[PDB]
């Protein structure tokens, strides 16, 4: 139902005339994104399989809807960029997004681990082409090579891990079939089997160790700022930790103990650096570490309460950090620098965009129940049942989550910009329309967060 109309977007951009292109790619994507909220939502007590195992059903993944939400949203801000260059260069880098969306639909839907693996690594190839090309600043290669040699270094151990499970215990396939899986006896040979399953989802889900993959990709901008949101889709795209820990190793949690603590220090120290940093895109790059680290802590506890907040945080972060990158892009195409201090001035120069700057920054804080409060609060409550000492460290993190976003506000809420003379037009219709399409879904999830937070809810 979802694959085939998404594949038919590929000949759409190539066959259409030279003056159009962007009109057809945006309009047809919006009607397909409507059908995702029409058919996928239906479920019973245990979510029943879709069809044959080419693409399967969703049990605890309404995160597909977020990919369908960014399916037209990534095409909006990429209008100002790429417009100067040739028509063939435009047609290629629109279809690379469609190819990304093709593989991204395949990752969340298909209830597998063997075929899921060759879709998890398959998303890295289109992003590699996007990140390495169109870089405004230099050191594109010091982020492009970093994009593979961190992920593939951790994910290639899945080939020796996943196949080892199916060769001993039946077959992986449906996961709904996986009741054959027996608890681990805790042996030294089984130590590296657990580590190989984890390490793939320890790189894309950023810790404190091996976290350097993320900020390098964000600072060195792929195209404008809307292709940065595709890298946000890859953080939440590593959702296999929800499936491996729950099924393949449920008895194993003794080896999780140091890895919780490694992500726990990736909260205080990741927030400390994000205070004196000069680059505006880097300030969102390090804030994205902490929010996804909260998910990492939640998964390894394995309590039924933590997953309720973990799945909610995947949707919460994917529409708020992407909203923040669009605000960084809206200054990047006017001032032509990622410097925070140089680009300073809201309301006096940017009147209506300043209110969007508020709502995006307030979502990093704990607002009245939208999705960010709902997502975070379950994790804090789950950590206390895990160990009572946690909120002494977790509370300090709550202080600097204010400093994550208020420092972004203060260094933009000042009536100066004496050196600057540009940025005459504050928002050319679509510039604010991007910001509304990011916040209004979060405002609609205030009334119904049952659709978002749902691992057996």
């Amino acid at each position: 139902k979802y694959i085939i109309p998404t594949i038919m977007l590929m000949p759409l951009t190539w066959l259409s005339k030279n003056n159009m292109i962007w009109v057809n790619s945006t309009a047809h994507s919006l009607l397909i994104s409507f059908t995702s909220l029409l058919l996928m939502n239906q479920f019973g007590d245990n979510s029943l399989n879709f069809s044959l195992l080419f693409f399967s059903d969703s049990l605890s993944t309404p995160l597909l809807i977020l990919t369908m939400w960014l399916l037209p949203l990534m095409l909006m801000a990429s209008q100002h960029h790429l417009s100067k260059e040739n028509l063939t260069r435009k047609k290629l880098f629109i279809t690379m997004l469609i190819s990304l969306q093709l593989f991204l639909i395949m990752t969340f839907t298909a209830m597998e681990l063997i075929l899921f693996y060759i879709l998890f690594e398959a998303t890295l190839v289109p992003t590699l082409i996007i990140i390495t090309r169109w870089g405004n600043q230099t050191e594109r290669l010091n982020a492009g090579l970093y994009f593979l040699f961190y992920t593939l270094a951790g994910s290639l151990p899945l080939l020796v891990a996943l196949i080892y499970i199916q060769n001993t215990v039946g077959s992986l396939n449906f996961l709904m079939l996986q009741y054959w899986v027996q608890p681990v006896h805790n042996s030294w040979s089984n130590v590296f089997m657990w580590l190989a399953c984890m390490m793939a989802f320890m790189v894309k889900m950023p810790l404190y160790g091996l976290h350097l993959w993320l900020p390098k990709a964000h600072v060195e901008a792929p195209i404008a700022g809307s292709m940065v949101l595709a890298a946000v889709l890859l953080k939440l795209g590593g959702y296999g930790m929800l499936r491996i820990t729950l099924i393949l190793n449920p008895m194993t949690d003794f080896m999780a103990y140091p890895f919780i603590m490694l992500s726990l220090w990736g909260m205080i120290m990741t927030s400390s650096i994000c205070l004196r940093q000069t680059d505006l895109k880097s300030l969102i790059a390090y804030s994205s570490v902490s929010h996804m680290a909260l998910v990492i802590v939640a998964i390894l506890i394995q309590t039924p309460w933590s997953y309720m907040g973990a799945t909610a945080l995947m949707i919460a972060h994917g529409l708020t950090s992407s909203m923040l990158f669009c605000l960084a892009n809206s200054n990047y195409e006017r001032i032509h620098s990622r410097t925070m201090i140089l680009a300073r001035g809201l309301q006096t120069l940017l009147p209506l965009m300043a209110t969007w700057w508020l709502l995006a920054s307030l979502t990093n804080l704990a607002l009245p129940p939208t999705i960010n409060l709902i997502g975070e609060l379950f994790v804090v409550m789950s950590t206390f049942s895990w160990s009572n000492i946690t909120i002494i460290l977790m509370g300090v993190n709550m202080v600097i989550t204010a400093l994550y976003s208020l420092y972004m506000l203060i260094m933009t809420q000042r009536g100066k910009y004496t050196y600057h003379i540009n940025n005459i037009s504050p928002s050319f219709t679509r510039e604010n329309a991007l910001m509304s399409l990011h916040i209004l879904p979060l405002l609609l999830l205030t009334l119904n967060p049952k659709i978002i937070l749902g691992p057996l809810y």
């Binding site: 008895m251 309590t303 895990w386």
Partner: protein
Amino acid sequence: XXXXXXXXXXXXXXXXXXXXXXXXXXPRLAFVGFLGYCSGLIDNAIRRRPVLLAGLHRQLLYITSFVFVGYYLLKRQDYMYAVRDHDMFSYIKSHXXXXXXXXXXXXXXXXXXX
């Protein structure tokens, strides 16, 4: 099996075991047909010719050749998987002692806390 034991060595088709029935307009055949069409798109990029899709009508040769070779390739696929299953099921019945059945049991297992 790597080495032949029942079938005669060096043969293009099966012939000895022909009864299996080949696929008719299979979903796998459509992808190979798409690959034949894909080769007729990229050849106009190497040899610079107007339009990838609306170019020369030598593309029909590329579609047919991939389908024709692919049909014999898919015929070998369904044959070899069938022989693999035929040898496996015959091995269990001939030995009998190698396979053992155990069903319906209630056994204790350690439960994890938190």
